[PDB]
Ligand binder design. Structure first.
Ligand code: FAD
Ligand code: 64X
Length: 637
């Protein structure tokens, strides 16, 4: 009897196969000869973009311990080459066939394949990925189209990538929108660059869900009246968040687009633009597109005549060249039969942690949970440890399964409340999910075991990447000690993030929203740092066209478009003139002050510790006994 069968080998399965090989657990992989989108993109020479996720959250711990030297955003090519490197290590373990059906019984499954062969296995792991409509569109996109108008009914990372490829050829973009959430993928902290995933300090939720909400959600919800933020200059960007019913913020089910702000793009790539573009580093600053009018937002009910290919807005019947509507990703699951008779219906909220479907036995799903920020690696690495322990330790399997339905019910009450199941339920804050798995497995850290301020910085402020939980214990990886030390030294031990939570501890949500936007450059969608980059943008467009070997006529003035832009930016034109220079910027000052205190007490025992220093030490001491630490779905009762 085959112990483990893994169906699908791309990226999500790598960490599980590593752990199964380590324990010499019998396993067999079955993965299709076709491959993944990355294979198709590679064969067509379309790996010409970059990840929207940081290196430290997008590659696995056992690679980072060898290759991590700085924070950066990998290219699609680098990502695919890592997929291939690991495929080559385990190819001998891969049967190249396509699973068509899985018959599930009480203690084993019967696996059917297109070739006609059948397999039996006690444990079956699905890591088959998702089908996505936009994938084929990106695979067939002619990036030389020029001087055309495009209408988008959906916004997302894939749409934003297409928009980044259309903008340089003088194409005009109309977003027919009911809002979207976009976030600078890299931000300045006291002028220093930080990927957004580095500044989430998720474990502060344990201090207070309200405190963590104040600290995180002002860039998403319209909480500040600051005229420099994009959702006040372009109100059509605001989404209807009436569905949210959980007290855990950021809520499960929230999705965001991560993009290069032009000021950080300039900082990294200005000295070698053509090469960086050719490597896949494309400027996709949606806020800059709105600022310059190259993209406009129009109401969702703006009428479209699909026969005549026109859209009517601002009293203008505007011809358009192409309409783009993305679809919903759907899991690539084969037929699964409960008790070998009843077809299984996949529902994220009816699985535990996105991994254990409670209607099946010894079947696990790997790679179907999506991170709100950061790369999938954080999620699939922790899922792989979870699945590995379930497969190889019967006592853990029983501890989790004995009260499975009760665990799922408690999880859904905590993260979704009374909200009805949504399409995006499978999206989770990565620092909540990794910490949830760590506590289930037992490789978590305990806040009450911190002894020094430095220990508290590590517990609360050091990002909950998967490798954080692989320094000690059951799933320890050699070299993680040096990795953690390097990450700490290059991030000032995450004191700046720790200080943020400290600065807003006594504020309400409105006061926190204003404080988060009181910096000279606040983290997300700061419209004060766009106009100064118009000249660089022209330089960038010239470089992009040279790379793609296209000539574009930028002489013809599109008066019609200028008219539509003026209509679409009426609010911006009323709001932006209210921006005022200030003498002091509270967030910049409070952070600078806090960092000086923390580093002055870094190696001090927590028990040994004007007024700000006194009140801050008091808050720090309470961090040893957080009052919101309970997660009911962790218990076995
Ligand atoms: C355009 C795009 C950009 C992305 N950018 C990022 C990013 O910046 N950062 C990030 O972290 N993630 C990103 N992702 C997500 C993630 O990195 C990829 O989706 C990744 O390919 C998912 O890995 P996987 O192993 O789960 O799926 P896949 O890579 O699709 O692997 C699934 C494999 O299983 C095979 N298979 C499927 N069904 C069967 C079957 N029935 N029988 C046998 N074999 C089967 C498939 O052929 C394939 O080889 C992006 C995804 C897309 C589409
Ligand atoms: N106050 C934090 C907010 C923050 C930092 N990183 C984030 C990622 C997603 C979301 Br939503 C919010 C954040 C900051 O601006 O550094």
């Amino acid at each position: 009897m085959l112990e483990v069968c893994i169906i699908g080998f791309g990226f999500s399965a790598i960490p599980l196969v590593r752990e199964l090989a380590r324990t010499q657990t019998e396993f067999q992989i079955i993965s299709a000869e076709s491959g993944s989108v990355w294979d198709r993109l590679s064969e067509s020479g379309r790996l010409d973009f970059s990840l929207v996720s940081s290196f430290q959250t997008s590659f696995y711990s056992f690679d980072l311990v060898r290759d991590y030297e700085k924070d950066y955003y990998p290219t699609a090519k680098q990502f695919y080459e890592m997929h291939e490197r690991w495929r080559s290590v385990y190819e001998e373990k891969i049967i190249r066939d396509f699973v068509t059906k899985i018959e599930n019984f009480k203690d084993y499954s019967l696996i059917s394949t297109r070739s006609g062969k059948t397999y039996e296995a006690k444990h079956v792991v699905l890591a088959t990925g998702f089908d996505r409509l936009m994938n084929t569109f990106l695979s067939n996109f002619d990036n030389h189209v020029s001087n055309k108008t495009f209408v988008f009914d959906t916004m997302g990372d894939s749409a934003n990538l297409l928009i980044a490829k259309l903008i340089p050829n003088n194409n005009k973009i109309i977003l027919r929108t009911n809002g979207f959430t976009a976030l600078d993928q890299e931000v300045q902290v006291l002028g220093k660059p930080f990927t957004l995933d580095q500044l989430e300090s998720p474990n502060f939720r344990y201090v207070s869900s309200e405190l963590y909400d104040r600290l995180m959600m002002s860039p998403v919800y319209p909480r500040t009246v600051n005229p420099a933020v994009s959702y006040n200059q372009f109100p059509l960007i605001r989404r209807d968040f009436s569905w949210v019913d959980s007290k855990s913020s950021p809520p499960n089910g929230l999705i965001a687009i991560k993009y290069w702000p032009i000021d950080q793009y300039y900082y990294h790539f200005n000295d070698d633009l053509e090469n960086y573009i050719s490597k896949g580093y494309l400027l996709n600053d949606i806020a800059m597109w709105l600022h310059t009018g190259k993209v406009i937002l129009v109401p969702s009910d703006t009428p479209i005549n699909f026969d005549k290919k026109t859209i009517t807005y601002a009293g203008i019947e505007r011809s358009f060249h192409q309409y783009v509507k993305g679809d919903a990703e759907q899991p690539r699951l084969p037929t699964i039969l409960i008790n070998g008779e009843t077809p299984f219906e996949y529902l994220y909220r009816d699985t535990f942690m996105g991994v254990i479907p409670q209607r099946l036995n010894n079947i696990y799903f790997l790679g179907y949970t999506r991170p709100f920020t950061g790369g999938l690696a954080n999620i699939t690495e922790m899922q792989s440890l979870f699945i590995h322990k379930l497969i190889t330790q019967p006592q853990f399997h029983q501890k989790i399964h004995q009260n499975l339905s009760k665990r799922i019910t408690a999880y859904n009450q905590h993260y979704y409340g009374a909200a009805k199941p949504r399409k995006h339920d499978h999206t989770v804050p990565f620092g909540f999910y990794t910490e949830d798995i760590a506590r289930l497995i037992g490789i978590h850290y305990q806040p009450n075991e911190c002894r020094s301020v430095r220990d508290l910085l590590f517990y609360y402020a050091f990002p909950n990447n998967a490798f954080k939980y692989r320094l000690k214990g059951e799933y320890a990886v050699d070299g993680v000690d040096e990795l953690i030390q390097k990450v700490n030294d290059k991030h000032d031990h995450y004191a700046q993030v720790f200080v943020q939570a400290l600065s807003i501890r006594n504020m309400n949500s409105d006061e926190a929203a204003e404080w988060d936007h009181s910096a000279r450059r606040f983290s997300f969608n700061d419209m004060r740092h766009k106009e100064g980059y118009r000249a660089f943008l022209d330089t960038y467009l010239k470089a992009y066209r040279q790379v793609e070997n296209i000539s574009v006529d930028d002489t013809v003035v599109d008066e019609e478009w200028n008219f539509m832009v003026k209509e679409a930016c009426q609010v911006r034109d009323k709001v932006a003139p209210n921006i005022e220079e200030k003498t002091h910027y509270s967030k910049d000052e409070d952070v600078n002050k806090g960092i000086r205190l923390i580093l002055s007490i870094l190696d001090s025992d927590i028990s040994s510790l004007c007024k700000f220093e006194a009140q801050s030490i008091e808050f720090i001491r309470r961090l040893l006994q957080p009052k919101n630490y309970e997660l009911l779905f962790i218990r076995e009762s």
